Amino acid sequence: EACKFLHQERMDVCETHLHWHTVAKETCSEKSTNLHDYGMLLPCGIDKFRGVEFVCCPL
């Protein structure tokens, strides 16, 4: 297994870093992997974002 690159965004809400980190972590965990790194997408408002791209790696 290699690591997998994934991209998630929302068109209905802007959310903080913490929400997107949470989404990325839980997504990797559902896929039996660990989140290694992530970057926010589509900055919104003064401190929010509309998505995240991230890399899930084997346990």
Ligand SMILES: [Cu+2]
């Ligand atoms: Cu974080």
